[PDB]
Design a binder for this molecule. Structure first.
Ligand SMILES: [Mg+2]
Ligand SMILES: [Mg+2]
Ligand SMILES: [Mg+2]
Ligand SMILES: [Mg+2]
Ligand SMILES: [Mg+2]
Ligand SMILES: [Mg+2]
Ligand SMILES: [Mg+2]
Ligand SMILES: [Mg+2]
Ligand SMILES: [Mg+2]
Ligand SMILES: [Mg+2]
Ligand SMILES: [Mg+2]
Ligand SMILES: [Mg+2]
Ligand SMILES: [Mg+2]
Ligand SMILES: [Mg+2]
Ligand SMILES: [Mg+2]
Ligand SMILES: [Mg+2]
Ligand SMILES: [Mg+2]
Ligand SMILES: [Mg+2]
Ligand SMILES: [Mg+2]
Ligand SMILES: [Mg+2]
Ligand SMILES: [Mg+2]
Ligand SMILES: [Mg+2]
Ligand SMILES: [Mg+2]
Ligand SMILES: [Mg+2]
Ligand SMILES: [Mg+2]
Ligand SMILES: [Mg+2]
Ligand SMILES: [Mg+2]
Ligand SMILES: [Mg+2]
Ligand SMILES: [Mg+2]
Ligand SMILES: [Mg+2]
Ligand SMILES: [Mg+2]
Ligand SMILES: [Mg+2]
Ligand SMILES: [Mg+2]
Ligand SMILES: [Mg+2]
Ligand SMILES: [Mg+2]
Ligand SMILES: [Mg+2]
Ligand SMILES: [Mg+2]
Ligand SMILES: [Mg+2]
Ligand SMILES: [Mg+2]
Ligand SMILES: [Mg+2]
Ligand SMILES: [Mg+2]
Ligand SMILES: [Mg+2]
Ligand SMILES: [Mg+2]
Ligand SMILES: [Mg+2]
Ligand SMILES: [Mg+2]
Ligand SMILES: [Mg+2]
Ligand SMILES: [Mg+2]
Ligand SMILES: [Mg+2]
Ligand SMILES: [Mg+2]
Ligand SMILES: [Mg+2]
Ligand SMILES: [Mg+2]
Ligand SMILES: [Mg+2]
Ligand SMILES: [Mg+2]
Ligand SMILES: [Mg+2]
Ligand SMILES: [Mg+2]
Ligand SMILES: [Mg+2]
Ligand SMILES: [Mg+2]
Ligand SMILES: [Mg+2]
Ligand SMILES: [Mg+2]
Ligand SMILES: [Mg+2]
Ligand SMILES: [Mg+2]
Ligand SMILES: [Mg+2]
Ligand SMILES: [Mg+2]
Ligand SMILES: [Mg+2]
Ligand SMILES: [Mg+2]
Ligand SMILES: [Mg+2]
Ligand SMILES: [Mg+2]
Ligand SMILES: [Mg+2]
Ligand SMILES: [Mg+2]
Ligand SMILES: [Mg+2]
Ligand SMILES: [Mg+2]
Ligand SMILES: [Mg+2]
Ligand SMILES: [Mg+2]
Ligand SMILES: [Mg+2]
Ligand SMILES: [Mg+2]
Ligand SMILES: [Mg+2]
Ligand SMILES: [Mg+2]
Ligand SMILES: [Mg+2]
Ligand SMILES: [Mg+2]
Ligand SMILES: [Mg+2]
Ligand SMILES: [Mg+2]
Ligand SMILES: [Mg+2]
Ligand SMILES: [Mg+2]
Ligand SMILES: [Mg+2]
Ligand SMILES: [Mg+2]
Ligand SMILES: [Mg+2]
Ligand SMILES: [Mg+2]
Ligand SMILES: [Mg+2]
Ligand SMILES: [Mg+2]
Ligand SMILES: [Mg+2]
Ligand SMILES: [Mg+2]
Ligand SMILES: [Mg+2]
Ligand SMILES: [Mg+2]
Ligand SMILES: [Mg+2]
Ligand SMILES: [Mg+2]
Ligand SMILES: [Mg+2]
Ligand SMILES: [Mg+2]
Ligand SMILES: [Mg+2]
Ligand SMILES: [Mg+2]
Ligand SMILES: [Mg+2]
Ligand SMILES: [Mg+2]
Ligand SMILES: [Mg+2]
Ligand SMILES: [Mg+2]
Ligand SMILES: [Mg+2]
Ligand SMILES: [Mg+2]
Ligand SMILES: [Mg+2]
Ligand SMILES: [Mg+2]
Ligand SMILES: [Mg+2]
Ligand SMILES: [Mg+2]
Ligand SMILES: [Mg+2]
Ligand SMILES: [Mg+2]
Ligand SMILES: [Mg+2]
Ligand SMILES: [Mg+2]
Ligand SMILES: [Mg+2]
Ligand SMILES: [Mg+2]
Ligand SMILES: [Mg+2]
Ligand SMILES: [Mg+2]
Ligand SMILES: [Mg+2]
Ligand SMILES: [Mg+2]
Ligand SMILES: [Mg+2]
Ligand SMILES: [Mg+2]
Ligand SMILES: [Mg+2]
Ligand SMILES: [Mg+2]
Ligand SMILES: [Mg+2]
Ligand SMILES: [Mg+2]
Ligand SMILES: [Mg+2]
Ligand SMILES: [Mg+2]
Ligand SMILES: [Mg+2]
Ligand SMILES: [Mg+2]
Ligand SMILES: [Mg+2]
Ligand SMILES: [Mg+2]
Ligand SMILES: [Mg+2]
Ligand SMILES: [Mg+2]
Ligand SMILES: [Mg+2]
Ligand SMILES: [Mg+2]
Lengths: 137, 122
RNA sequence: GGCUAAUCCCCCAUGUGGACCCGCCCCUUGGGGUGUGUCCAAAGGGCUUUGCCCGCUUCCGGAUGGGCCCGCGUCCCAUCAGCUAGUUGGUGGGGUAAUGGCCCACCAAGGCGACGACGGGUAGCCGGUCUGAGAGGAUGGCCGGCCACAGGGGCACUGAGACACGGGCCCCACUCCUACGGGAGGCAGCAGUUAGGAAUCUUCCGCAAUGGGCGCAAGCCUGACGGAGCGACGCCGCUUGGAGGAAGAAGCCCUUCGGGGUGUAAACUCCUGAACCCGGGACGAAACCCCCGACGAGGGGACUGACGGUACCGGGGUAAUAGCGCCGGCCAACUCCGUGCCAGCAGCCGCGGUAAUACGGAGGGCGCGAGCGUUACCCGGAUUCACUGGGCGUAAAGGGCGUGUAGGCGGCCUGGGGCGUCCCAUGUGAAAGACCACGGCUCAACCGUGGGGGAGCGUGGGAUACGCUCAGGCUAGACGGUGGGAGAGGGUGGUGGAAUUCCCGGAGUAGCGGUGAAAUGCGCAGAUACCGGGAGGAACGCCGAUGGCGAAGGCAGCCACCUGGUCCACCCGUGACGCUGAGGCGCGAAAGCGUGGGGAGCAAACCGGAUUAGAUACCCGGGUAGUCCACGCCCUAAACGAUGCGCGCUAGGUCUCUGGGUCUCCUGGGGGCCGAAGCUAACGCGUUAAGCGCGCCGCCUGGGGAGUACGGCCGCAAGG
RNA sequence: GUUCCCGGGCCUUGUACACACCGCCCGUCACGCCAUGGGAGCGGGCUCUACCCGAAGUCGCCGGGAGCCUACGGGCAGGCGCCGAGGGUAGGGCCCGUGACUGGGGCGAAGUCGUAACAAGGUAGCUGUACCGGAAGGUGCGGCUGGAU
C-alpha cells in the first residue's frame, strides 16, 4: 500500500456514504494528528486507539445529520467532501500567503507545518505554511 | 496521463493550419488571369459560377472567384485576390477583389457597394 | 633633392613614488608589507608679470564605463542516436589588462550523450506588449537596456578604449569616370531614386532650447535633437446646428382603396455663430558671458525663439461635409416588385425549380458614425493538450502476454542531520509602462508628481510536521521452512482401441452415389452391401460439465520420466527485501516460408457437373499445396472480458470447482448468475467494479486520405 | 385445410431503413478537375572530407657577396618561413525545384457492369493470413459474436 493518508481519508469516505457507526484505520502518529483536527473541527465524534487481532488500529466514530422526511430518508452527511491534495505522486506545499480558503470559510484545509498539523485559520494565525494535506467540508 | 507522464512527455500544443496557402502571410495578392471561364458547382446546387485561373506573385497558381453580376475579366487580366472559399465550388479557396486593377466593379449596384467595388452614384 | 618650429621623438640628472627578480612577515589562488640589487618621470602656453589661470610628469584612493568566469532559465523534428584529434586533461612556453586549448610543443587516454549529445529547422534576447477570470497562450514594431552587424569575407594599424558605418590593407562580386594611358565608390546615418510588394513619408526649418565634441573664454560643429511637411494608419477631442413648427405639404413605399408610412422629418419663424475678416500675441530663455565682490559664496547686468505673427486672448461674422455595413436562424432590423436551381448569395446550417422577409432594386427599418465594411494574423470563446481543468467496455483511445534495466513511487516506532518545505530580517528586482491619488495642457488622448507591491535569486537567523538522508528497532507488506492438495499447465519417450481410405482372400448381383430435383462420377473389366486378413496416417467417442490449467497464445485416449505455476494448514524462519515498469530480452493461434520426412481423412488453387441472364460462387463428383513430424524462420489477429498491474476500503442471495476446520455450517482460493451503496450518455457495471481512493506504465485528440508514402530497423520472401 | 400467392390485425426479434425495402449501399471500368508517391534523369541550395595554389597581415628566423640610419651588442629596408580570405582538383551527405511515364488517392457526375454489406440481406457477419477471380468478392485454415431462429 502506497499511501496511508489517502487510504485513511478514503476508508472514512466509504463508511460515511453508507452510514456506518465507525470504521478502523491502521494507526499512525500522523493519522492521530489529522483525526485530532477532524475531531476538534467536528467532522467526527472522536476516535480511540483499539487493537485488531494483535494489530494496532484507530477506530473512528462517525457523525451524521438527522433523518429526513421524503422518499430518501437518508440523513445529510457531516463530511460532504474529503480528498487529498498533496500526494506521493505530486507533492503540494503552500507558502502562508497562498493558503486556500476552503468553500468560502464553511470548510477546512488540513496542513503539515513545522509547527504541527494546523487548519487554514490556524496557519494564518501562527503565520506559517506547510504541505497541504487535504480539504474537508 | 499521470503527473509523471506529463513531466516526461508534456502536453502537445498542436499548430494551426492556414486555409489560404497561396497568400503566404499577406492580406492580399496580385496576379494575372490565365484562364477565365465558368464551372458548375456541387450538390445540391446548379449554376455557372465565374472563376479565374490566376498565377500569383507568390509563385502559387490557384483558382479564384469572380463575385457579382457580370465582369470584364479575360485572359491576361491583372487582378487582386483575397481570402475565402466559395463553399460549393471545390478547389476555389480565394476571391477576386472587384474594383481593383483590370477588375472593374459591378455595373449598376446600389446596395453594399464596397464589397463590389462600385462608386457612389449621382 | 635641400632647409625650418613646437605641448613632435631621444639621452643624462632627481626617485615622493612605481615596476621586476631573490629573501623574510602577514595574508591566503597573483592580496598587504619590507630589505639588498636594477629600471622609469616630465612641456610649455598666457595674462593684469617674484603672482594667478589652462596644461605636463610619477604614485595612491574615488567615481564611472568595461573585459573575463560561474549557478540557474531560454523554440520545433528522435523519421537527426550516438558525437569528439586541440578532441579531454597534465606539463612547459607563447599571448593579453587578465584567467583559459586562447595559441604551440611534449605527455596521458581521455571529454559529451535519452535529465536528448551530434545533426537538421527557426529566431537577435529582455523591460515589456496583446489576450485571458486566473493559470496559460501569443508576441518582442515604437520607447529603454544588452548583443550582433556596417556591400560579401579575411586581417591588422593608430589608440585608455576599435580589430573601427561616414579610418586603413587585401580578395571577391558590382557600378562608374576618363583624355582609353588609368583611377574612384560602399545610405542597415537624414531626406531622396529604383526594384520587389497588398503596403510604409519632405531631397523641410533650426542650433532658440536639451544633449554631445573641441576650446581659458568668445565661439565653431552637431540630419543627435527641437520642430515643421505628408498618410483617418491608431487613439482622443470636435463639426455638419438649437428651440419652435400640421392629426401632419408634395414625392416615393405599402393598402382590404376606408387608409398606413417616411415625419417635426421638410417647408417656414426666431435664436446661436465651424469656417473665414481685424487687432493684440505668447509660455518655452537664463544661463554661459559682463559687473562689484575674490575668476569662489552671494548680489546685480545685458544678449539670445527654428516652431511663429503660430497657439492663445479680444472684436466682427457665414446654418455651414455624411457616409458605410446589415435586416432567414445565430443576431438588432420587413414589406412590394423583378428573377424562376437562371442570375446570383454564402462564416456555419442553408437559400434560388412562378407569392424568395435569404438573389437584384426600391420603400421602410436596424447598427455605428469621418468614418463603415473586407482580407490576413495573434489570444479568447476551445475543460478541443485538460497545472488550474479531460479522457480509454460499446463513442477516438489498455501495449497480444510475460520477464526485467533506468526511472517514478513506497509500511509501523525512535533519534542525528536539516536537502526539499514553512517563517523572519536584509540586499537586488533600473527608467518608461501597469495600477491608485493628485495635478498641467479649456477636457481628453497625451503628459507630470507621489504611492503600493510581487515573484525570483544572493546573504544571515529560525522552524522540524510531511517528503529526503543517515542510524537503531518492529512485524501488519514481501519472501522462506515444515506438511499436504487439485489440475487437458509444459517437454521427451512409449503405447490402446473406434472409424475412414487402399490393398488381399472369400461370398454375392445390377446397380451404387449424390441433390431441392439432377448430372458429373463409379459399376458385368463384377461396383455397392457383408465376412476374414493386412497396410498406413491423423484425431481421441462416452467421462465432458454453465468444469479444470496456464501470463497470454493455448492445452483433452492411456502409460512412465523430466519440469513450471498455484492453493491450503501451522504461524516456525528473514525483517520493507515492496509496487510498477521507457528501452531490453523471451513467449506468442492460424496461415505462410526454408531443408528433410510423412501423406489415411480434409482441402485454398485447379478440373468437371449442376443452378443461373451470367455463376470466374453458393450445391454435387474429383483434386494439388497445405493440414501431421523434426529443426530453423515469420510475429500478425474480433491475440476479446473489445476492460494495464498492484494495493486498501464500500450490503447481501444463490449456483459450482478446489483446500482446511469445531463439517448444520464456518473459513481461505478460483469459476458463473442476481443484486446494496455508488458509477454510467444510455446500455449496463457492481468485493472478478465499469464504485470510493493511491502508485507507475501504455494509449486517445473530427471522418477520409492511411496503417498509405518517405526515411529507418527487421525478414528468405510474404511482409512486420 | 391456412403449407403456398396477395392484403391486413396483435405480441415479439434484427436493422447501417426514416424520401421508411419502389429504403439503403459496395467496388471495377469510361470522362473531367486537384493534390500526392515512384521514375532513366535534369537543375539549384547548403554541407563535409583530402590535397594543390595562395593576397593582406600578425608572429618567428635572417638581415650576409648587401643598402640607409646611428641613437652602431641597434634600427629600418630587404630575404625566407608558419598560419591564412579564398581560388582550384576529387569524392561524399542532407534538402529543394523539376521529369517522358507510371501507382493508387480526393472530388465531380445526370454514365457502364454487376449486388458484396445493412432483414437469417436471401451462402450469418466480421477477421489475420493464403491462393484465385472483370469488379464488388470467393474459397481454404484458425479466430471473434459485434450472429436471427
Ligand atoms: Mg491539485
Ligand atoms: Mg505580376
Ligand atoms: Mg439548390
Ligand atoms: Mg486587359
Ligand atoms: Mg475566412
Ligand atoms: Mg449582400
Ligand atoms: Mg632646432
Ligand atoms: Mg633616466
Ligand atoms: Mg524529443
Ligand atoms: Mg580548443
Ligand atoms: Mg599539439
Ligand atoms: Mg537557417
Ligand atoms: Mg534571424
Ligand atoms: Mg479560459
Ligand atoms: Mg520573437
Ligand atoms: Mg513586428
Ligand atoms: Mg528598441
Ligand atoms: Mg560581418
Ligand atoms: Mg546594401
Ligand atoms: Mg568590405
Ligand atoms: Mg566586413
Ligand atoms: Mg585617444
Ligand atoms: Mg585591448
Ligand atoms: Mg571610424
Ligand atoms: Mg573599416
Ligand atoms: Mg564591430
Ligand atoms: Mg555609410
Ligand atoms: Mg569619376
Ligand atoms: Mg592620357
Ligand atoms: Mg592603382
Ligand atoms: Mg555618393
Ligand atoms: Mg510594383
Ligand atoms: Mg522613401
Ligand atoms: Mg517622422
Ligand atoms: Mg544647440
Ligand atoms: Mg570646457
Ligand atoms: Mg556643418
Ligand atoms: Mg539640416
Ligand atoms: Mg526629428
Ligand atoms: Mg391622420
Ligand atoms: Mg401622421
Ligand atoms: Mg405624405
Ligand atoms: Mg397619407
Ligand atoms: Mg428640427
Ligand atoms: Mg521666451
Ligand atoms: Mg448675426
Ligand atoms: Mg455589421
Ligand atoms: Mg452583433
Ligand atoms: Mg430579429
Ligand atoms: Mg434570366
Ligand atoms: Mg416573387
Ligand atoms: Mg442574408
Ligand atoms: Mg432582400
Ligand atoms: Mg472620432
Ligand atoms: Mg478597419
Ligand atoms: Mg482560435
Ligand atoms: Mg486551454
Ligand atoms: Mg489533468
Ligand atoms: Mg473529452
Ligand atoms: Mg489486455
Ligand atoms: Mg509485440
Ligand atoms: Mg512486471
Ligand atoms: Mg529500482
Ligand atoms: Mg525514494
Ligand atoms: Mg515514509
Ligand atoms: Mg527522520
Ligand atoms: Mg532545509
Ligand atoms: Mg524580496
Ligand atoms: Mg519598475
Ligand atoms: Mg486637471
Ligand atoms: Mg499584480
Ligand atoms: Mg528531527
Ligand atoms: Mg532502518
Ligand atoms: Mg505476513
Ligand atoms: Mg474384393
Ligand atoms: Mg462376363
Ligand atoms: Mg472387412
Ligand atoms: Mg484460471
Ligand atoms: Mg513470526
Ligand atoms: Mg518493455
Ligand atoms: Mg506464430
Ligand atoms: Mg502452422
Ligand atoms: Mg507459395
Ligand atoms: Mg512446410
Ligand atoms: Mg515436402
Ligand atoms: Mg467450374
Ligand atoms: Mg456452367
Ligand atoms: Mg464450379
Ligand atoms: Mg468440393
Ligand atoms: Mg511449397
Ligand atoms: Mg503451411
Ligand atoms: Mg472471447
Ligand atoms: Mg482475461
Ligand atoms: Mg486492440
Ligand atoms: Mg473501438
Ligand atoms: Mg502496463
Ligand atoms: Mg486506468
Ligand atoms: Mg468449501
Ligand atoms: Mg475438506
Ligand atoms: Mg467466490
Ligand atoms: Mg470455465
Ligand atoms: Mg450484474
Ligand atoms: Mg440503486
Ligand atoms: Mg458475491
Ligand atoms: Mg467509463
Ligand atoms: Mg483535416
Ligand atoms: Mg484525419
Ligand atoms: Mg506497414
Ligand atoms: Mg496490416
Ligand atoms: Mg519503406
Ligand atoms: Mg402476410
Ligand atoms: Mg386483435
Ligand atoms: Mg414485425
Ligand atoms: Mg431491393
Ligand atoms: Mg515528383
Ligand atoms: Mg525524388
Ligand atoms: Mg544533381
Ligand atoms: Mg546536387
Ligand atoms: Mg594535387
Ligand atoms: Mg601554405
Ligand atoms: Mg645589421
Ligand atoms: Mg622586415
Ligand atoms: Mg585552407
Ligand atoms: Mg577550401
Ligand atoms: Mg583569389
Ligand atoms: Mg509526378
Ligand atoms: Mg501523377
Ligand atoms: Mg496521375
Ligand atoms: Mg446481397
Ligand atoms: Mg450473404
Ligand atoms: Mg457473403
Ligand atoms: Mg478469410
Ligand atoms: Mg474477364
Ligand atoms: Mg473459388
Ligand atoms: Mg483467441
Amino acid at each position: 500500500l502506497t499511501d496511508p493518508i489517502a487510504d485513511m481519508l478514503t476508508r472514512i469516505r466509504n463508511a460515511t456514504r453508507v452510514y456506518k457507526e465507525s470504521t478502523d484505520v491502521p494507526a499512525s502518529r500522523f493519522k492521530e494528528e489529522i483525526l485530532r483536527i477532524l475531531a476538534r473541527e467536528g467532522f467526527i465524534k472522536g476516535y480511540e486507539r483499539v487493537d485488531v487481532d494483535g494489530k494496532p488500529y484507530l477506530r473512528v466514530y462517525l457523525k451524521y445529520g438527522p433523518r429526513r422526511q421524503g422518499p430518501d430518508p437518508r440523513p445529510e452527511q457531516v463530511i460532504h467532501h474529503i480528498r487529498r491534495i498533496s500526494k506521493p505522486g505530486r507533492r503540494v506545499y503552500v507558502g502562508v500567503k497562498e493558503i486556500p480558503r476552503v468553500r468560502r470559510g464553511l470548510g477546512i484545509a488540513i496542513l503539515s507545518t513545522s509547527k504541527g498539523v494546523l487548519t487554514d485559520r490556524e496557519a494564518r494565525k501562527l503565520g506559517v505554511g506547510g504541505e497541504l494535506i487535504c480539504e474537508v467540508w | 496521463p499521470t503527473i509523471n507522464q506529463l513531466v516526461r512527455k508534456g502536453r502537445e500544443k498542436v499548430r494551426k493550419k492556414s486555409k489560404v496557402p497561396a497568400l503566404k502571410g499577406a492580406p492580399f495578392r496580385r496576379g494575372v488571369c490565365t484562364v477565365v471561364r465558368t464551372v458548375t458547382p456541387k450538390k445540391p446546387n446548379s449554376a455557372l459560377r465565374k472563376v479565374a485561373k490566376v498565377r500569383l506573385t507568390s509563385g502559387y497558381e490557384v483558382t479564384a472567384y469572380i463575385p457579382g453580376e457580370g465582369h470584364n475579366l479575360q485572359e491576361h487580366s491583372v487582378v487582386l485576390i483575397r481570402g475565402g472559399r466559395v463553399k460549393d465550388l471545390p478547389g476555389v479557396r480565394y476571391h477576386i477583389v472587384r474594383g481593383v486593377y483590370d477588375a472593374a466593379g459591378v455595373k449598376d449596384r446600389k446596395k453594399s457597394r464596397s464589397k463590389y467595388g462600385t462608386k457612389k452614384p449621382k
